[PDB]
């Protein structure tokens, strides 16, 4: 008790060291020598110990390479208003452009609020590591109905995910991966040496494989991870970047249908571990800089990629995440946003625009039940639309922006509190117009050629439910330079992520929604200022009047039901639909904004609906009548005009 001394023997000499754990227990909290001494079978007869070790996988080809960690967190700026995460001031303490950062000491303690067990009591682990208990956070996963599960257990120093499968019988197979700075790896119990367990090693980073030979076998049949690249990328890559690299990897699997048919393959399993590493990276970042200060721009960006990540992880798999959200950072972000000209965010700069919407997503939860957050997301979008012709550059800096904003918009839509419904309905309208044949077309092109990940598109929130397996294949680019086979996958992928990112209730808000009987035959709805048009293949909509295009090439007919004053009458229109009158009156050059609060809808005689446009302002109308948006010298394509009134007309002048 208290005092204990051991004797050694270096070279021909007897060394004498005395270890008084009595004094140590005072200066240390979690150090309970009594337990650890028992954990390690001191009287484990020579023979029995051996098998307790040989029944453990051996990282035969323990390989490593040069991988110096990249520069992540920037050095706090000038008068950066450094705030505590534990408690936010009853008022504001910043502006919008003012420098700011958060204290690590509190932020970390808030993230890793939960306490746990990095090392469970399962047979495999209990043989190698010493029962450990510290603040952590994990990522729960369950596929094939609890027949397979993954756990992203991580602490401020190291991550340790574990795989768990079950054969038809009570057979339980487990294999885990341990990532983190070599110096931080847990304590090994019996005759174990990390080298014979490490798979990849850097100058200070390691990747350990803890599992039994019996298990490694059942796993090697469907899980052969590329430890090499999987390790490097997990080391040499900024937190924010790694987060998206994973987010994209998932989007791919989503388009592969792996979100309804969760394939138990190397790829799917690999992404899982990386998903937790993405979260670990962020936590390990705030850790390295203890008692330091992380720039708010860094968090708004890093923590953003995590929020977006957590959602897809949940929508796809019934996975859960806890131990990485700090109510502090949320209150701060929330307050900061509440102090900015939201309705004028679009007139701001690009870099500032992202940061704005970016953090707007992070703080949406903790506060902003009456803050004009959705408004800002609209303003920024509005600007984007006005500057172009219903299509955003495939890889523009702003494209990334609209993606960040959509999140704070979707979240809003999912709710049942009709707040800013009019301001929100607009967002849908715009995005819908943006989901033009040009857009949907280019997106596919990129998907096939593998240039575009397909992470975001204004369609995901648009009210264009016209694109189907076949219809989508129509907008696809017709070129021999594109593998007809590859194209199909793209079309399929897009259709997939579209059915997951977009829900049927995304429109339970729109006033006119309540007016559609056979809503399944609805091509697309156009929310206007004083009215709302419903394009469908059924004359069941109970609007104010019924319009029908001259084309009958399609399977069914092309109807146009306008709900005046967003309130519908009882019963559909009388027999015989009203025919769309043809007009050639209007002249190209236009002084004022004639078709202002109106919208344009072009459809191909053979295929479905092509592109739709909402002329926001004067500048837009000009960039349409001047450009070659029109092509009356094509009998196949027609151009319709929906006005503030339930009237519709074709153009050809």
């Amino acid at each position: 008790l208290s005092e204990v001394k051991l004797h050694l023997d270096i070279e021909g000499h007897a060394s004498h060291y005395t270890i008084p754990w009595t004094e140590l227990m005072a200066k240390v909290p979690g150090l309970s020598p009594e337990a650890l001494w028992r954990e390690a079978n001191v009287t484990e007869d020579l023979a029995s110990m051996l098998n307790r070790y040989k029944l453990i996988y051996k990282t035969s080809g323990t390989l490593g390479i040069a991988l110096a960690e990249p520069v992540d967190i920037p050095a706090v700026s000038e008068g950066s208003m450094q705030v505590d995460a534990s408690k936010v001031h009853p008022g504001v303490i910043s502006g919008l452009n003012s420098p700011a950062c958060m204290l690590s000491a509190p932020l970390e303690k808030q993230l890793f609020y939960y306490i746990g067990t990095m090392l469970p009591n399962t047979r495999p682990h209990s043989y190698v590591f010493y029962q450990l208990r510290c603040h952590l956070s994990y990522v729960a996963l369950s596929i094939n109905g609890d027949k397979f599960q993954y756990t992203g257990a991580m602490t401020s120093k190291f991550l340790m995910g574990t795989y768990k499968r079950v054969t038809e019988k009570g057979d339980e197979h487990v294999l885990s991966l341990v990532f983190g700075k070599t110096k931080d790896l847990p304590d090994l119990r019996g005759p174990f040496s990390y080298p014979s367990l490490t798979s990849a090693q850097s100058g200070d980073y390691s990747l350990v494989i803890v599992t039994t030979f019996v298990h490694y076998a059942n796993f090697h049949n469907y899980f052969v991870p590329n430890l090499k690249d999987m390790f490097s990328r997990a080391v040499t890559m900024t937190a924010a970047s790694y987060a998206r690299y994973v987010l994209q990897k998932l989007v791919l699997l989503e388009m592969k249908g792996g979100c309804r048919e969760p394939e138990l393959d190397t790829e799917t399993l690999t992404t899982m571990f990386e998903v937790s590493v993405a979260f670990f990276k962020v936590g390990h970042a705030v850790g390295e800089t203890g008692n330091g200060c992380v720039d708010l721009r860094w968090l708004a960006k890093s923590f953003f990629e995590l929020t977006v990540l957590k959602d897809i992880i949940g929508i796809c798999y019934g996975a859960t995440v806890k131990g990485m959200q700090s109510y502090g950072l949320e209150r701060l972000a929330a307050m900061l946003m509440a102090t900015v000209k939201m309705e004028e965010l679009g007139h701001l700069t690009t870099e500032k625009q992202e940061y704005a919407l970016r953090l707007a997503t992070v703080g949406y939860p903790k506060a902003g039940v009456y803050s004009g957050l959705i408004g800002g997301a609209t303003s920024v979008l509005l600007s984007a639309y006005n500057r172009h012709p219903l299509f955003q550059p495939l890889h523009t800096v702003m494209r990334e922006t609209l993606f960040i904003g959509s999140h704070v918009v979707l979240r809003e839509l999912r709710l049942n509190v009709t707040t800013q419904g009019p301001n929100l309905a607009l967002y849908q309208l715009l995005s819908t117009a943006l989901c033009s044949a040009l857009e949907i077309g280019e997106v596919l092109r990129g998907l096939a050629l593998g240039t575009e990940s397909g992470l975001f598109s204004p369609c995901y929130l648009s009210l264009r439910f016209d694109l189907t397996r076949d219809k989508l294949l129509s907008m696809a680019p017709q070129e021999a330079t594109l593998d007809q086979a590859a194209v199909s996958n793209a079309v399929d992928g897009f259709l997939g992520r579209l059915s997951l990112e977009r829900e049927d209730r995304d429109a339970w808000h729109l006033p006119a929604y309540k007016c559609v009987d056979r809503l399944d035959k609805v091509l697309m709805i156009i929310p206007l200022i004083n009215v709302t048009f419903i394009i469908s293949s059924d004359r069941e909509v109970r609007g104010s009047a019924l319009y029908e295009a001259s084309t009958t090439y399609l399977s069914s007919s092309l109807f146009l039901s306008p709900v005046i004053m967003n309130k519908c009458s009882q019963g559909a229109v009388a027999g015989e639909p009203r025919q769309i009158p043809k007009i050639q009156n209007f002249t190209r050059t236009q002084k004022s904004c004639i078709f202002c609060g109106f919208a344009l809808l072009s459809y191909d005689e053979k295929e479905g609906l092509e592109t739709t446009t909402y002329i926001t302002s004067q500048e837009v109308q000009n960039s349409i009548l001047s450009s070659n948006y029109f092509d009356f010298d094509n009998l196949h394509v027609h151009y319709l005009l929906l006005t503030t009134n339930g009237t519709v007309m074709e153009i050809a002048g």
Binding site: E3, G12, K27, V42, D45
Partner: protein, 108 residues
Amino acid sequence: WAYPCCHVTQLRAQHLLALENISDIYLVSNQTCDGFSLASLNSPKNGSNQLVISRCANGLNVVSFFISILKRSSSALTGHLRELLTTLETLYGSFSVEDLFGANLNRY
């Protein structure tokens, strides 16, 4: 170059020694006995050093334990309790487990 080695046996259905009564621990070298990382747990009985009880333990396991405690509380130790770790770790890695597969474990 050390002390007598032994034949480590488990104590089935009885009771063991705790840290509470032990205070001396003798360790061996990667060549003294025969590759076997052995340790001796010495603890005085009754009052002081009258009759000393000395039983065998598994070196590797013991050493690992100590190596762990030292690391788990680095924030509260300097002097010997810091060099002891680095030297104790090198010792731990001086033994070869995989050799015991073919080696006779009843040599003592």
